[PDB]
Amino acid sequence: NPFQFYLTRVSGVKPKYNSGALHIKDILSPLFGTLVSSAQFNYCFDVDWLVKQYPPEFRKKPILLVHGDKREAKAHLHAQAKPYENISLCQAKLDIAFGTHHTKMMLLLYEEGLRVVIHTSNLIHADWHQKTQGIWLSPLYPRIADGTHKSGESPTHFKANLISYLTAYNAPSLKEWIDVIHKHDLSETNVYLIGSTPGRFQGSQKDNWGHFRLKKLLKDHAAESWPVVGQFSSVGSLGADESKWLCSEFKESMLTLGSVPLYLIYPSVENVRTSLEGYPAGGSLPYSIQTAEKQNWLHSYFHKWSAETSGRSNAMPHIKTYMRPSPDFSKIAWFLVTSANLSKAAWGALETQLMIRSYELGVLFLPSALGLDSFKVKQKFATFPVPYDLPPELYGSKDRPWIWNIPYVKAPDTHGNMWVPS
């Protein structure tokens, strides 16, 4: 399979929906290779749980947790790690206010080579239980034979791009991982890396990250009434109206190729209420009332979560995807899976300079990287496995976007419960 794009396993659905799916234990299994050390980039960790995901034989191998926690949260993370002397931590610098280290990535070094995993899940039980999450698995990258003189670079420039991403942390513990990558052959990589890193970027550096990075790749490597579809689990404040950022800079970047319809997929209250988890699913869809009330104009772009194609309509989405389907949705010009949600913090906002608050990371699937002009959409999850149903379905007149910090008490959920934050 050229894509190596997978969904996580979901408990509570029929086996046929989990046949081509992966659980974290599968990813860290000995069949994937003989582990030497690993790095886990993430936002939230449950260390006890994480260590138990590693095979008993690999549990004592060194692990670097790359996080962005500060002060008491940091102290708590260190406390969690104390019992396992093989674990080290790297605190990603967040020098801009309200940023987060949101990137989800695993670097897995084996006796047999190196694997890179870019995904959407936090390292806590809940994120791998009943949610729709995405995973990209790199090939097993062999080590470069001393004596040979090789870049190990791919036509997508993944190797250099990944090193620039890590270089941006300006972190001692990452240097060893940079040197490790240098030593391996990543030439088989057929995806483009799309990262965000905190900063204010000017001149040419604007194209290095966020939506300008996506824009640059689409211009260089890609009846244009083809819609843009955005699908995510959180929404930041986008402004008083669509012209402030959504339709002006975000949409502009995404429509780039070489009156466009913008469809946004985000679960409604009903989607959450009737999910496998019920309302608690909503603890992982953090759209706040304070933010939403300021931007009701946005909700007219909202579409329901529906994933019959992958048997996941009841598995709330934590994956984030962006794509450009044809007018009839039978094909797509490109597809991106990433940790970036719908917000300026993740994607960047122009100030000229581009301001980004967080670390985010995703991979872009372009037909040209496979020598194609388009991908046909796989109907049932060269044909790209879109994990939700198309076309997207608009919210009904009585639907509301899930907002996590208000109570829902008129209708009980899947488990007979109400939701009362506070």
mmCIF file of C-alpha atoms in Angstrom, residues 12-352:
data_model
loop_
_atom_site.group_PDB
_atom_site.id
_atom_site.type_symbol
_atom_site.label_atom_id
_atom_site.label_comp_id
_atom_site.label_asym_id
_atom_site.label_seq_id
_atom_site.Cartn_x
_atom_site.Cartn_y
_atom_site.Cartn_z
ATOM 1 C CA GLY A 12 -17.211 -1.774 20.696
ATOM 2 C CA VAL A 13 -17.446 -2.248 16.972
ATOM 3 C CA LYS A 14 -17.475 -5.332 14.755
ATOM 4 C CA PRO A 15 -14.129 -6.999 13.973
ATOM 5 C CA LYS A 16 -14.389 -6.204 10.301
ATOM 6 C CA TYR A 17 -14.007 -2.534 11.236
ATOM 7 C CA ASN A 18 -10.796 -3.312 13.108
ATOM 8 C CA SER A 19 -9.186 -5.632 10.547
ATOM 9 C CA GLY A 20 -6.933 -3.060 8.896
ATOM 10 C CA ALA A 21 -6.641 -1.012 12.080
ATOM 11 C CA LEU A 22 -3.746 -0.625 14.482
ATOM 12 C CA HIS A 23 -3.491 -0.389 18.223
ATOM 13 C CA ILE A 24 -0.458 1.168 19.872
ATOM 14 C CA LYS A 25 0.633 -2.331 21.015
ATOM 15 C CA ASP A 26 0.667 -3.356 17.345
ATOM 16 C CA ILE A 27 2.850 -0.422 16.406
ATOM 17 C CA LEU A 28 5.369 -1.196 19.158
ATOM 18 C CA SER A 29 5.294 -4.968 18.549
ATOM 19 C CA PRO A 30 8.495 -7.011 18.076
ATOM 20 C CA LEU A 31 7.370 -7.933 14.588
ATOM 21 C CA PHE A 32 7.963 -4.280 13.631
ATOM 22 C CA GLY A 33 11.622 -4.740 14.611
ATOM 23 C CA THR A 34 14.105 -5.139 17.487
ATOM 24 C CA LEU A 35 13.793 -1.997 19.593
ATOM 25 C CA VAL A 36 16.867 -0.110 20.754
ATOM 26 C CA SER A 37 15.346 3.211 21.842
ATOM 27 C CA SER A 38 12.403 5.463 21.074
ATOM 28 C CA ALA A 39 11.105 8.997 21.262
ATOM 29 C CA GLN A 40 7.496 9.886 21.986
ATOM 30 C CA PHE A 41 6.410 13.407 21.007
ATOM 31 C CA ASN A 42 3.025 14.244 22.431
ATOM 32 C CA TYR A 43 0.686 16.558 24.376
ATOM 33 C CA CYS A 44 -0.661 14.291 27.169
ATOM 34 C CA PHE A 45 0.946 11.178 28.634
ATOM 35 C CA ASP A 46 -0.036 8.447 31.058
ATOM 36 C CA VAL A 47 3.363 6.973 31.658
ATOM 37 C CA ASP A 48 2.269 3.909 33.544
ATOM 38 C CA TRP A 49 -0.036 3.131 30.659
ATOM 39 C CA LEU A 50 2.505 4.014 27.976
ATOM 40 C CA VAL A 51 5.179 1.759 29.354
ATOM 41 C CA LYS A 52 2.645 -1.105 29.425
ATOM 42 C CA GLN A 53 2.036 -0.593 25.702
ATOM 43 C CA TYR A 54 5.678 -1.541 24.974
ATOM 44 C CA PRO A 55 6.406 -5.281 24.706
ATOM 45 C CA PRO A 56 7.787 -6.702 27.963
ATOM 46 C CA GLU A 57 11.128 -7.273 26.193
ATOM 47 C CA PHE A 58 11.306 -3.592 25.160
ATOM 48 C CA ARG A 59 10.072 -1.919 28.336
ATOM 49 C CA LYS A 60 13.540 -1.288 29.658
ATOM 50 C CA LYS A 61 14.834 0.371 26.456
ATOM 51 C CA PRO A 62 15.379 4.146 26.626
ATOM 52 C CA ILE A 63 12.406 6.449 25.975
ATOM 53 C CA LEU A 64 12.426 10.190 25.510
ATOM 54 C CA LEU A 65 9.144 11.975 26.159
ATOM 55 C CA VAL A 66 8.965 15.283 24.279
ATOM 56 C CA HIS A 67 6.281 17.464 25.819
ATOM 57 C CA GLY A 68 5.528 21.091 26.416
ATOM 58 C CA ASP A 69 4.352 21.026 30.024
ATOM 59 C CA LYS A 70 5.279 23.848 32.381
ATOM 60 C CA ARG A 71 5.611 24.327 36.120
ATOM 61 C CA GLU A 72 3.231 22.153 38.127
ATOM 62 C CA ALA A 73 2.095 20.186 35.085
ATOM 63 C CA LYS A 74 5.787 19.601 34.388
ATOM 64 C CA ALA A 75 6.530 18.558 37.962
ATOM 65 C CA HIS A 76 3.672 16.099 37.694
ATOM 66 C CA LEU A 77 4.952 14.640 34.439
ATOM 67 C CA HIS A 78 8.408 14.142 35.990
ATOM 68 C CA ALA A 79 6.827 12.432 38.982
ATOM 69 C CA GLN A 80 4.986 10.080 36.642
ATOM 70 C CA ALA A 81 8.283 9.166 34.984
ATOM 71 C CA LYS A 82 10.481 8.761 38.103
ATOM 72 C CA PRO A 83 9.902 4.978 38.587
ATOM 73 C CA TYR A 84 11.242 4.169 35.141
ATOM 74 C CA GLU A 85 14.920 5.108 35.021
ATOM 75 C CA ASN A 86 15.030 4.495 31.243
ATOM 76 C CA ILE A 87 12.798 7.464 30.555
ATOM 77 C CA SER A 88 14.060 10.961 29.930
ATOM 78 C CA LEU A 89 12.063 14.103 29.210
ATOM 79 C CA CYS A 90 12.539 17.024 26.834
ATOM 80 C CA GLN A 91 10.551 20.156 27.499
ATOM 81 C CA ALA A 92 9.770 21.866 24.205
ATOM 82 C CA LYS A 93 10.119 25.586 24.508
ATOM 83 C CA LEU A 94 6.874 27.449 24.192
ATOM 84 C CA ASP A 95 7.976 31.065 24.072
ATOM 85 C CA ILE A 96 4.785 32.414 22.613
ATOM 86 C CA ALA A 97 1.749 32.755 24.849
ATOM 87 C CA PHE A 98 -1.030 30.143 24.718
ATOM 88 C CA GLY A 99 0.896 27.671 22.589
ATOM 89 C CA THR A 100 1.053 23.926 23.060
ATOM 90 C CA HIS A 101 3.361 21.109 22.114
ATOM 91 C CA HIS A 102 0.666 19.292 20.130
ATOM 92 C CA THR A 103 2.691 17.163 17.703
ATOM 93 C CA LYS A 104 2.078 13.422 17.832
ATOM 94 C CA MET A 105 5.037 11.416 16.637
ATOM 95 C CA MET A 106 7.028 8.346 17.451
ATOM 96 C CA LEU A 107 10.646 7.865 16.425
ATOM 97 C CA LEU A 108 11.471 4.167 16.705
ATOM 98 C CA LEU A 109 15.101 3.079 16.415
ATOM 99 C CA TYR A 110 15.677 -0.612 15.796
ATOM 100 C CA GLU A 111 18.645 -2.860 15.303
ATOM 101 C CA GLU A 112 17.223 -3.227 11.768
ATOM 102 C CA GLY A 113 16.607 0.431 11.015
ATOM 103 C CA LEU A 114 14.390 3.374 11.842
ATOM 104 C CA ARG A 115 10.650 4.007 11.777
ATOM 105 C CA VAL A 116 8.802 7.316 12.011
ATOM 106 C CA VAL A 117 5.158 7.363 13.047
ATOM 107 C CA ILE A 118 3.098 10.509 12.712
ATOM 108 C CA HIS A 119 -0.358 10.304 14.224
ATOM 109 C CA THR A 120 -3.142 12.041 16.129
ATOM 110 C CA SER A 121 -3.451 10.244 19.488
ATOM 111 C CA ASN A 122 -2.438 11.357 22.978
ATOM 112 C CA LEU A 123 -0.585 8.665 24.969
ATOM 113 C CA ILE A 124 -3.484 7.916 27.343
ATOM 114 C CA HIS A 125 -5.864 4.927 27.310
ATOM 115 C CA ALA A 126 -8.885 6.955 26.251
ATOM 116 C CA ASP A 127 -7.399 8.163 22.989
ATOM 117 C CA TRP A 128 -6.882 4.619 21.726
ATOM 118 C CA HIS A 129 -10.154 3.143 22.971
ATOM 119 C CA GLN A 130 -13.226 4.411 21.078
ATOM 120 C CA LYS A 131 -12.100 7.401 19.019
ATOM 121 C CA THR A 132 -11.396 7.823 15.337
ATOM 122 C CA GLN A 133 -7.657 8.550 15.139
ATOM 123 C CA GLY A 134 -5.195 8.553 12.212
ATOM 124 C CA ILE A 135 -1.778 7.034 11.778
ATOM 125 C CA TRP A 136 0.905 7.287 9.135
ATOM 126 C CA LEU A 137 3.596 4.634 9.195
ATOM 127 C CA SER A 138 6.887 5.311 7.432
ATOM 128 C CA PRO A 139 8.740 2.452 5.775
ATOM 129 C CA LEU A 140 11.464 0.714 7.747
ATOM 130 C CA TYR A 141 14.327 3.033 6.897
ATOM 131 C CA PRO A 142 17.653 1.149 6.647
ATOM 132 C CA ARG A 143 20.836 2.596 8.082
ATOM 133 C CA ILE A 144 23.282 4.058 5.566
ATOM 134 C CA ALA A 145 26.196 1.710 4.926
ATOM 135 C CA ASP A 146 29.417 3.354 6.121
ATOM 136 C CA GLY A 147 31.620 3.504 3.048
ATOM 137 C CA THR A 148 28.777 4.576 0.866
ATOM 138 C CA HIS A 149 28.204 8.295 0.231
ATOM 139 C CA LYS A 150 24.485 8.975 0.354
ATOM 140 C CA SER A 151 22.003 11.693 1.149
ATOM 141 C CA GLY A 152 19.294 9.188 1.967
ATOM 142 C CA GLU A 153 16.932 11.932 0.802
ATOM 143 C CA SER A 154 13.525 11.383 -0.855
ATOM 144 C CA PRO A 155 12.051 13.376 -3.754
ATOM 145 C CA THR A 156 9.660 14.849 -1.183
ATOM 146 C CA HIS A 157 12.672 16.057 0.863
ATOM 147 C CA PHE A 158 11.213 14.360 3.941
ATOM 148 C CA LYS A 159 14.603 13.727 5.541
ATOM 149 C CA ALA A 160 15.816 17.343 5.517
ATOM 150 C CA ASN A 161 12.302 18.533 6.383
ATOM 151 C CA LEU A 162 12.136 16.295 9.438
ATOM 152 C CA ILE A 163 15.603 17.474 10.559
ATOM 153 C CA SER A 164 14.615 21.122 10.176
ATOM 154 C CA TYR A 165 11.512 20.349 12.265
ATOM 155 C CA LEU A 166 13.598 18.814 15.058
ATOM 156 C CA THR A 167 16.260 21.496 14.758
ATOM 157 C CA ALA A 168 13.648 24.061 15.628
ATOM 158 C CA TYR A 169 13.341 22.678 19.182
ATOM 159 C CA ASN A 170 16.922 23.752 19.789
ATOM 160 C CA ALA A 171 17.060 20.824 22.267
ATOM 161 C CA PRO A 172 20.072 18.795 23.407
ATOM 162 C CA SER A 173 18.172 15.502 23.622
ATOM 163 C CA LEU A 174 16.869 15.936 20.083
ATOM 164 C CA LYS A 175 20.391 16.312 18.645
ATOM 165 C CA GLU A 176 20.967 12.588 19.108
ATOM 166 C CA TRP A 177 17.775 11.883 17.225
ATOM 167 C CA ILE A 178 18.833 14.291 14.435
ATOM 168 C CA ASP A 179 22.142 12.395 14.114
ATOM 169 C CA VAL A 180 20.252 9.158 14.073
ATOM 170 C CA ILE A 181 18.089 10.387 11.178
ATOM 171 C CA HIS A 182 21.195 11.564 9.315
ATOM 172 C CA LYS A 183 22.490 8.050 9.510
ATOM 173 C CA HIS A 184 19.480 6.469 7.844
ATOM 174 C CA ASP A 185 18.109 6.204 4.297
ATOM 175 C CA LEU A 186 14.675 7.847 4.058
ATOM 176 C CA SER A 187 14.620 7.895 0.233
ATOM 177 C CA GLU A 188 11.536 5.718 -0.068
ATOM 178 C CA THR A 189 9.337 8.321 1.686
ATOM 179 C CA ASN A 190 6.471 9.389 -0.542
ATOM 180 C CA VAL A 191 4.722 11.950 1.672
ATOM 181 C CA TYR A 192 5.500 15.607 2.393
ATOM 182 C CA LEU A 193 6.065 16.725 5.997
ATOM 183 C CA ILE A 194 3.944 19.645 7.168
ATOM 184 C CA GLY A 195 5.002 21.094 10.481
ATOM 185 C CA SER A 196 4.185 24.052 12.683
ATOM 186 C CA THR A 197 6.662 25.441 15.175
ATOM 187 C CA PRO A 198 6.268 28.471 17.456
ATOM 188 C CA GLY A 199 7.668 31.720 16.140
ATOM 189 C CA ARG A 200 7.284 34.781 13.959
ATOM 190 C CA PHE A 201 8.412 33.992 10.439
ATOM 191 C CA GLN A 202 9.419 36.510 7.823
ATOM 192 C CA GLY A 203 10.598 36.735 4.263
ATOM 193 C CA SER A 204 11.117 33.262 2.956
ATOM 194 C CA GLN A 205 10.864 31.575 6.322
ATOM 195 C CA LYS A 206 7.120 32.150 6.145
ATOM 196 C CA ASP A 207 6.943 29.171 3.798
ATOM 197 C CA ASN A 208 8.636 26.812 6.233
ATOM 198 C CA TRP A 209 5.619 26.214 8.489
ATOM 199 C CA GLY A 210 1.871 26.212 8.951
ATOM 200 C CA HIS A 211 -0.564 27.033 6.216
ATOM 201 C CA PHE A 212 2.066 28.834 4.169
ATOM 202 C CA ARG A 213 4.032 25.593 4.100
ATOM 203 C CA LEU A 214 0.949 23.823 2.775
ATOM 204 C CA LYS A 215 0.390 26.638 0.289
ATOM 205 C CA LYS A 216 3.990 26.308 -1.000
ATOM 206 C CA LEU A 217 3.753 22.576 -1.521
ATOM 207 C CA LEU A 218 0.405 22.862 -3.337
ATOM 208 C CA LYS A 219 1.731 25.557 -5.641
ATOM 209 C CA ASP A 220 4.917 23.615 -6.428
ATOM 210 C CA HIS A 221 3.605 20.052 -6.533
ATOM 211 C CA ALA A 222 -0.083 20.062 -7.353
ATOM 212 C CA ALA A 223 -13.066 23.234 -13.143
ATOM 213 C CA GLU A 224 -11.517 24.411 -9.889
ATOM 214 C CA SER A 225 -14.872 24.563 -8.068
ATOM 215 C CA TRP A 226 -13.353 21.570 -6.188
ATOM 216 C CA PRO A 227 -14.318 22.084 -2.537
ATOM 217 C CA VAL A 228 -11.919 22.091 0.410
ATOM 218 C CA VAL A 229 -12.881 19.854 3.332
ATOM 219 C CA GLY A 230 -11.521 20.499 6.854
ATOM 220 C CA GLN A 231 -12.179 18.042 9.701
ATOM 221 C CA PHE A 232 -10.924 18.562 13.256
ATOM 222 C CA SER A 233 -11.666 18.213 16.988
ATOM 223 C CA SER A 234 -11.032 21.696 18.319
ATOM 224 C CA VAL A 235 -11.678 25.265 17.152
ATOM 225 C CA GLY A 236 -9.839 28.411 18.246
ATOM 226 C CA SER A 237 -11.172 31.965 17.945
ATOM 227 C CA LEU A 238 -11.091 32.854 14.260
ATOM 228 C CA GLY A 239 -12.485 36.386 14.506
ATOM 229 C CA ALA A 240 -15.660 38.453 14.130
ATOM 230 C CA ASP A 241 -16.250 37.213 10.577
ATOM 231 C CA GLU A 242 -14.902 34.776 7.954
ATOM 232 C CA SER A 243 -12.881 37.470 6.202
ATOM 233 C CA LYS A 244 -10.675 37.939 9.241
ATOM 234 C CA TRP A 245 -8.745 34.663 8.776
ATOM 235 C CA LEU A 246 -10.805 31.628 7.767
ATOM 236 C CA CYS A 247 -11.755 32.576 4.217
ATOM 237 C CA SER A 248 -8.977 35.101 3.829
ATOM 238 C CA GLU A 249 -5.745 33.347 4.696
ATOM 239 C CA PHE A 250 -6.617 29.788 5.694
ATOM 240 C CA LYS A 251 -8.925 29.055 2.773
ATOM 241 C CA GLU A 252 -6.639 30.876 0.364
ATOM 242 C CA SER A 253 -3.745 28.601 1.261
ATOM 243 C CA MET A 254 -5.848 25.462 0.985
ATOM 244 C CA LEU A 255 -7.424 26.282 -2.381
ATOM 245 C CA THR A 256 -3.990 26.791 -3.912
ATOM 246 C CA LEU A 257 -3.146 24.434 -6.800
ATOM 247 C CA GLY A 258 -0.137 24.762 -9.110
ATOM 248 C CA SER A 259 -16.308 30.942 -4.752
ATOM 249 C CA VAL A 260 -14.735 27.670 -3.637
ATOM 250 C CA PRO A 261 -16.979 25.792 -1.203
ATOM 251 C CA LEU A 262 -15.518 25.298 2.270
ATOM 252 C CA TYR A 263 -16.911 22.342 4.218
ATOM 253 C CA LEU A 264 -15.980 21.877 7.900
ATOM 254 C CA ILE A 265 -16.635 18.609 9.706
ATOM 255 C CA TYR A 266 -17.033 18.833 13.485
ATOM 256 C CA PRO A 267 -19.351 16.770 15.695
ATOM 257 C CA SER A 268 -22.710 18.117 16.722
ATOM 258 C CA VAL A 269 -24.167 17.649 20.193
ATOM 259 C CA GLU A 270 -26.239 14.755 18.890
ATOM 260 C CA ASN A 271 -23.163 13.109 17.336
ATOM 261 C CA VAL A 272 -21.520 13.259 20.754
ATOM 262 C CA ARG A 273 -24.638 12.367 22.752
ATOM 263 C CA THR A 274 -25.161 9.113 20.830
ATOM 264 C CA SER A 275 -21.497 8.120 20.497
ATOM 265 C CA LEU A 276 -19.953 4.951 21.934
ATOM 266 C CA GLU A 277 -18.682 7.033 24.839
ATOM 267 C CA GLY A 278 -21.636 9.330 25.188
ATOM 268 C CA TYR A 279 -21.022 12.881 26.473
ATOM 269 C CA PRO A 280 -17.576 12.138 27.969
ATOM 270 C CA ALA A 281 -16.419 11.892 24.320
ATOM 271 C CA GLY A 282 -16.849 15.621 24.529
ATOM 272 C CA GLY A 283 -13.986 15.965 26.963
ATOM 273 C CA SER A 284 -11.798 15.466 23.870
ATOM 274 C CA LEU A 285 -13.617 18.099 21.744
ATOM 275 C CA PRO A 286 -12.624 21.269 23.620
ATOM 276 C CA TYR A 287 -14.596 24.025 21.843
ATOM 277 C CA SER A 288 -15.426 26.516 24.601
ATOM 278 C CA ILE A 289 -18.585 28.574 24.960
ATOM 279 C CA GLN A 290 -16.494 31.686 25.404
ATOM 280 C CA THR A 291 -14.935 31.140 22.008
ATOM 281 C CA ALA A 292 -18.016 29.955 20.146
ATOM 282 C CA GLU A 293 -20.357 32.746 21.258
ATOM 283 C CA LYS A 294 -17.950 35.203 19.638
ATOM 284 C CA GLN A 295 -18.174 33.521 16.280
ATOM 285 C CA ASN A 296 -21.570 32.006 15.607
ATOM 286 C CA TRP A 297 -21.025 32.939 11.966
ATOM 287 C CA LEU A 298 -18.756 29.924 11.671
ATOM 288 C CA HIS A 299 -21.328 27.305 12.523
ATOM 289 C CA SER A 300 -23.039 27.704 9.201
ATOM 290 C CA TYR A 301 -19.979 25.963 7.752
ATOM 291 C CA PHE A 302 -20.420 22.981 10.046
ATOM 292 C CA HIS A 303 -21.125 19.462 8.919
ATOM 293 C CA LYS A 304 -21.890 16.329 10.957
ATOM 294 C CA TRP A 305 -19.534 13.492 11.709
ATOM 295 C CA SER A 306 -20.547 10.442 9.724
ATOM 296 C CA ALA A 307 -18.176 7.546 9.104
ATOM 297 C CA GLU A 308 -20.237 4.567 7.957
ATOM 298 C CA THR A 309 -17.504 3.857 5.405
ATOM 299 C CA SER A 310 -15.201 2.876 8.290
ATOM 300 C CA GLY A 311 -17.939 1.906 10.795
ATOM 301 C CA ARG A 312 -17.001 4.815 13.035
ATOM 302 C CA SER A 313 -19.942 7.217 13.043
ATOM 303 C CA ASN A 314 -20.155 6.510 16.784
ATOM 304 C CA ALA A 315 -16.403 6.784 17.391
ATOM 305 C CA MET A 316 -15.887 10.532 17.903
ATOM 306 C CA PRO A 317 -13.116 11.997 15.748
ATOM 307 C CA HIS A 318 -9.816 13.028 17.275
ATOM 308 C CA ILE A 319 -8.077 12.732 13.923
ATOM 309 C CA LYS A 320 -7.750 15.981 11.934
ATOM 310 C CA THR A 321 -7.777 15.883 8.129
ATOM 311 C CA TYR A 322 -7.841 18.374 5.284
ATOM 312 C CA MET A 323 -8.458 17.548 1.639
ATOM 313 C CA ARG A 324 -9.588 18.755 -1.787
ATOM 314 C CA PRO A 325 -12.188 16.514 -3.419
ATOM 315 C CA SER A 326 -13.675 16.933 -6.884
ATOM 316 C CA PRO A 327 -17.225 18.412 -7.266
ATOM 317 C CA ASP A 328 -18.756 14.941 -7.035
ATOM 318 C CA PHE A 329 -16.325 13.699 -4.310
ATOM 319 C CA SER A 330 -15.209 10.681 -6.347
ATOM 320 C CA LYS A 331 -11.624 11.839 -6.376
ATOM 321 C CA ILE A 332 -9.196 14.096 -4.522
ATOM 322 C CA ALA A 333 -6.296 16.363 -5.476
ATOM 323 C CA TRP A 334 -4.566 15.780 -2.096
ATOM 324 C CA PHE A 335 -5.089 14.663 1.510
ATOM 325 C CA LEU A 336 -3.439 15.810 4.726
ATOM 326 C CA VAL A 337 -3.578 14.072 8.136
ATOM 327 C CA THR A 338 -2.176 16.119 10.990
ATOM 328 C CA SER A 339 -2.423 17.141 14.627
ATOM 329 C CA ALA A 340 -3.449 20.688 13.586
ATOM 330 C CA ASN A 341 -7.027 21.657 14.507
ATOM 331 C CA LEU A 342 -8.931 24.660 13.170
ATOM 332 C CA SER A 343 -7.102 27.529 14.827
ATOM 333 C CA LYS A 344 -4.579 30.306 14.233
ATOM 334 C CA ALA A 345 -2.418 28.873 16.979
ATOM 335 C CA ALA A 346 -1.864 25.680 14.976
ATOM 336 C CA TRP A 347 -1.876 27.081 11.438
ATOM 337 C CA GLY A 348 -0.491 30.564 11.792
ATOM 338 C CA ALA A 349 -1.826 34.056 11.399
ATOM 339 C CA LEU A 350 -0.289 36.892 9.419
ATOM 340 C CA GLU A 351 1.025 39.926 11.296
ATOM 341 C CA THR A 352 4.712 40.991 7.112
#
